[PDB]
Curated annotation (Swiss-Prot), chain B:
Keyword RNA-binding: yes
Pfam families for this protein: Ribosomal_S11
A GO BP entry: translation
Further details from the record: Has been predicted to contact the N-terminal domain of IF-3 based on footprint studies; exactly how IF-3 interacts with the 30S subunit is controversial.
Source organism superkingdom: Bacteria
Protein name: Small ribosomal subunit protein uS11
Name of encoding gene: rpsK
Subunit structure comment from the entry: Part of the 30S ribosomal subunit. Interacts with proteins uS7 and bS18. Cross-links to IF-3. In stalled ribosomes contacts ribosome rescue factor SmrB.
UniProtKB/Swiss-Prot annotation, chain C:
Function per UniProt: Probbly involved in recognition of ribosome rescue factor SmrB in stalled/collided disomes; fusion of protein fragments to its N-terminus decreases ribosome rescue in the presence of SmrB.
Bias (Basic and acidic residues): 57-65
Basic residues bias locations: 43-56
Protein family per UniProt: Belongs to the bacterial ribosomal protein bS21 family.
Region Disordered: start-end pairs: 40-65
Biological process, per Gene Ontology: cytoplasmic translation; ribosomal small subunit assembly
Official protein name in the record: Small ribosomal subunit protein bS21
Pfam families hit by this protein: Ribosomal_S21 (PF01165)
GO annotations of cellular component type: cytoplasm; cytosol; cytosolic small ribosomal subunit
InterPro entries, sorted: Ribosomal_bS21, Ribosomal_bS21_CS, Ribosomal_bS21_sf
UniProt keywords, alphabetically: Ribonucleoprotein, Ribosomal protein, RNA-binding, rRNA-binding
Curated annotation (Swiss-Prot), chain D:
Oligomer status and interactors: Part of the 30S ribosomal subunit. Contacts proteins S9 and S11. Cross-links to IF3 and the P and E site tRNAs.
Protein name (Swiss-Prot/TrEMBL): Small ribosomal subunit protein uS7
PROSITE patterns linked: RIBOSOMAL_S7
Misc. remarks from the entry: The strain K12 sequence is shown.
GO cellular component, one term: cytosol
SUPFAM superfamilies: Ribosomal protein S7
Swiss-Prot record, chain E:
CDD domains associated with the record: RaiA
Keyword set, alphabetical order: Translation regulation
Protein purpose: During stationary phase, promotes and stabilizes dimerization of 70S ribosomes by the ribosome modulation factor (RMF), leading to the formation of inactive 100S ribosomes. Converts immature 90S particles formed by RMF into 100S ribosomes. Crystallization with T.thermophilus 70S ribosomes shows it binds in the channel between the head and body of the 30S subunit, where mRNA, tRNAs, initiation factors IF1 and IF3 and elongation factor G would bind; however RMF is still able to bind.
Disulfide bonds: none
Pfam families (UniProt xref): Ribosomal_S30AE
PANTHER family in the cross-refs: 30S RIBOSOMAL PROTEIN
GO cellular component, as recorded: cytosol; cytosolic small ribosomal subunit
GO molecular function annotations of the record: ribosomal small subunit binding; ribosome binding
Domain of life: Bacteria
Subunit structure of this chain's protein: Associates exclusively with 100S ribosomes, which are dimers of 70S ribosomes.
Induction: Induced during stationary growth phase (at protein level). Induced by the signal autoinducer AI-2.
Full protein name: Ribosome hibernation promoting factor
Family: Belongs to the HPF/YfiA ribosome-associated protein family. Short HPF subfamily.
Amino acid sequence: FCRFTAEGVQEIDYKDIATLKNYITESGKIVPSRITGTRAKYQRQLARAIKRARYLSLLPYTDRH
Amino acid sequence: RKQVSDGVAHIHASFNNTIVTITDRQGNALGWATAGGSGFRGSRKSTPFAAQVAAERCADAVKEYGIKNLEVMVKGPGPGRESTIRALNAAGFRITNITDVTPIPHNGCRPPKKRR
Amino acid sequence: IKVRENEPFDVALRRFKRSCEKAGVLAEVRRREFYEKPTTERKRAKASAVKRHAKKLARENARRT
Amino acid sequence: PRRRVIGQRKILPDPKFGSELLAKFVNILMVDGKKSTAESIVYSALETLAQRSGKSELEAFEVALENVRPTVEVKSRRVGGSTYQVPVEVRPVRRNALAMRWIVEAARKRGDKSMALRLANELSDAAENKGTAVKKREDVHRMAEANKAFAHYRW
Amino acid sequence: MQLNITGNNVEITEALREFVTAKFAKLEQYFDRINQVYVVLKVEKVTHTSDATLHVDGGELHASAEGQDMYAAIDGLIDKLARQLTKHKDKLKQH
RNA sequence: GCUUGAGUCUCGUAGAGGGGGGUAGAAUUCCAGGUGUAGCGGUGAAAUGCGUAGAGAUCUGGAGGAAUACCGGUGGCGAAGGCGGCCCCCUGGACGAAGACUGACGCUCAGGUGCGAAAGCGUGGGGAGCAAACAGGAUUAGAUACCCUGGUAGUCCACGCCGUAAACGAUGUCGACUUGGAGGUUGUGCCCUUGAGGCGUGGCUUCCGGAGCUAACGCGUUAAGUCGACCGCCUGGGGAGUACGGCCGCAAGGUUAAAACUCAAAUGAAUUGACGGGGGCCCGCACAAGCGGUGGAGCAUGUGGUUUAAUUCGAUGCAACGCG
């Protein structure tokens, strides 16, 4: 696999929640980069987009909501 | 009484004992049965068979309410937790949902020390 | 985690989702903060993971059979 | 043993009836290797079974045996630092042989006068299910069904 | 516990016999319940040597100790047997 | 004077670097209420403990404290100690590309000065969970311990003190030089960004190995190789990092640092065994599955012991005792 964020020159922001729900699992946990194959730089800022979307209720913390 | 149709069957699934209780959609309980009260005591409380006998003893005394469909909640890393649900669909129930609701802290309070 | 599947009842399709990360987590929050043994165990882990990489790559020479 | 799945050998059948099942039965109570003394007691004990039950002789013997044969057997299993009685289902070639051993050990006690009638009384009472041979079968099942909590198989 | 004291070229006295049984009363209760004891004392021109064979509920255990004046030999023999009795005891506890 | 060391500046980049303030969700505990009924909790088993005054389970609401699942990575950053949710404010360093600038401004330091895990200490708070001490229940020959149920300082916050750790890479700082391979992470240049492409080039970092080195184990461009600069330190084992003295500290204590006496060793690495209540694999009436015995009875016989003028001598765990 590869990183589509490195395929372009875009920025992973928290407001683009359509592309973040394929990066979390079926219970709200973040999928590791050893499965997805993301670069380590973009994976670190991806989780910063997951954690900000969880604060603004665009993504759930757990599945019991 | 109230003759409710759909319910929720919570399963507490500790290591030493398995507790199964049956409630409704609103969340207030109807009846319960444990593996320690089914005649199994001590080493046999931590058996999946003892969680089965706790289920059919709880599948009875809810005949007064008339449940034919229920959800299943499991909570704990027990030796039961799946042999209990096999004793419910065999008891004549429609299992709509099976849900894991075990408590996981996102790193909170300190657990006790590892015993040696 | 949440299976509301139709047809024939057989958790079977439930233990695929649940035995994923619902018992390794609860058995390690079961006791002891550790605070430094995680480190030891963690560092022993990957010194034995590259022991599987650097031996099985060198095991493809022959097999004496 | 460790090795050697043993090459099993056969038994010659009974002369009076075409059965090796009763020839296995006469070999069990054959004490000190005395077969003519063993076979005279069992023939005198099953003709007594016919008049005390009405039926024919040989099929009245196994109807006292299906009432005394077990289906599960409990074992001591060593696991951890202790050892509990796990139950296991019995193979059928052991199932009858475990049954007719329970008959003879109940026949050496339950002391009446002669050995032929000592065997003849409870071979009837095995069919009416009140003798002490059936109480060995039911108290084995009482311990195995109490220990249903030990088993990775569900049959 | 039944003692059986026996000497090869060491004719046992009365003070030595009670010295054995008082010492073998120690390794008694304090370590394990035992069935039957055979004690053998030997003198071999230098070595006051004392053997002992204990019989327990599991098996048997034997120890030997050569010493200085036949009193230190039995004093070293009991310390050899007491350690074998604690090793055998915890082999039969496994809690 | 010069620019190559060192430093300044202009652009960027990554980061659990630090300090301050806010805030979110999960979970534990407690409180209150609803439902509900005889158990819960715990262990190898058990009891203490809790519960018919309604526990536990379940649902709603509330209070409070501490910690930030997944991401999380032989990943990153920091001089070391250390630093993980998220947001803002203040702030330190490293690094790269292309230049410009000062012109040896450098390196290393005894004393000195600052920083410095955890525990502890002082004053003032806070206190969910955990938990020294302590209390009870077990286990045990005993258990002052391991296990169990509780549980106080402490853990948390502010401001001071302490100045110690297997504070470790058991490897001082700085500079130069000397075959390679597989990576991780983070900048950047060129060519066909024409495709996550190809070629390079830096920084930090992980592993494996060459020469050489080392007592060996190993180290191996981040040396323990080959050299230079300076500093700290070592001089047989015990006594002893102890006594005394000085200094520092509220205290605990830290630091500096002996001698008398005593021993002929202490020690390092590796080798062959043996052993392990280490691991794997295998066998034996070894266990299991069965049958018949012994131990209990009288007697035959042998031994120990006692007795005797002598009860001849030898055999003594298995492998002596119906044996010579």
